[PDB]
Amino acid sequence: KRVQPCSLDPATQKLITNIFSKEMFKNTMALMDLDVKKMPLGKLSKQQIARGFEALEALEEALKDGGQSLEELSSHFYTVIPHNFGHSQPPPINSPELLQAKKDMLLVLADIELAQALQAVSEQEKTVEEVPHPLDRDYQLLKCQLQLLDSGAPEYKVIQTYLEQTGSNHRCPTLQHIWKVNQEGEEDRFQAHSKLGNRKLLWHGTNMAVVAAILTSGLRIMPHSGGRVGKGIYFASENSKSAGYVIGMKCGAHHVGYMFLGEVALGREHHINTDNPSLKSPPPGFDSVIARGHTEPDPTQDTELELDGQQVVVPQGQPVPCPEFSSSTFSQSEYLIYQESQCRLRYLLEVH
Template structure:
């Protein structure tokens, strides 16, 4: 097929399998996302190489500058570090990860989000996991919403930015293994405003959520959620749902809560967290 011609695979002497169901299609879409982010990495390196020669710069500094993101390691003795460590320990679903590094990050490009962020309340610090190969693209260009031409299948609550208040949910998207035992996740300040709460998946977008539901985001209800009375609050008022995971009454489809926003401006990346299995 044209897909296998454009994206070579190694099938040996076997015929390429037909992409016959939504599970197979989702895997191929994830592959294309990885390749897209690798392309961004290569493009950034090419742009850097084409710049006029100046004073010698260490290669690590060159790569850091390409990310266009300010990063600062948190002290283990600091309050922020301790809150995030509690968030890890209480929402890991029993997997018992250890915190390797926590970086406080700021993307200059997200300064334009200030107006929307400031206009909404209910700010939460939420998890977003992704493959390590995607982080050059995420840090240099920000999180991205799937384009209109992308198939709508595979998005339980429509095309948006997905977050969770349980590490156990988001860490699955990091695809870490025993051979590559480090998982890297983002913690983002997400302005949820008034969330549309639903126990089941339904295809939504900002127009439906905002105009028809009178809400600003979607909250897919889970059967497990952090205890609210154990939450922490950062100095700027962002709530960290770092409580112990507790069962929630109801017949929810999801195991853990999911939070979806449909506008990039409702998100500000705050921390990069590296975990070891």
């Protein structure tokens, strides 16, 4: 069989290599204390991950009788999801904090399986005399359009300014590339909230392990997912806040990482200043919940982008003190929506 030449540019080739890298996945599983030998990448199954959540639920039930002890229930979760702790006795999941930690860990592992199941070779490919370059194939598996922007791009500078003004003044994240994300299947559903104004291009820092899944399914509100503002999709107006979630891998000397810029239909905003991990939707009449931080990218420096005939607000100024929320429980703002349809992936950034 002939292997057709790759039609991807260096940047997009590098990207597609990283986000499907089996070494990158194993690294992530190792960073989560998971036994990579007892749980090989090719062994990951939706069934196993489900059995894991079942164990987490029954354990959650025992945290809220004559049932099963926490020490005993925990021991079963580690039987289904093999952990690596230098061959010592694993920790008992006896706290709500540790409980959600394992849920978050399984959710990430769930997106690792999604990428694996996605790469599955179908019969259609096996009955063709010519195959695409491995990278083209992977790129096509995402069913998502990635157009690399340049310096001469209109929205490039807006994004670059947005990045440098809301990033950490010292540990500056270096912009390398910007991709225009056209996830096909996100426009149709996003046209629902086309009558809904108040749009803002917000940050979403993600670890490299779920980048493929996000490019394939978009930002999702998974079961067992949570946080300080409940069960929704988390965003940030400050790059620095999102970057704290960007877990990247080494590359010779640099620390590669990826961030998303999403067009969020905020509509009527319900402002809170206190953690509320029970939220599953905004209060009646509201379309989004916003955790106002002690600071906010100077609203007077906001600019607007024209995306698909829509005016989208894009912050451009440094964080300024917000006295009205000076004693808030959030240092930085956390934007929330509680239905996936309100988010539209717009740009993918590669930072160093």
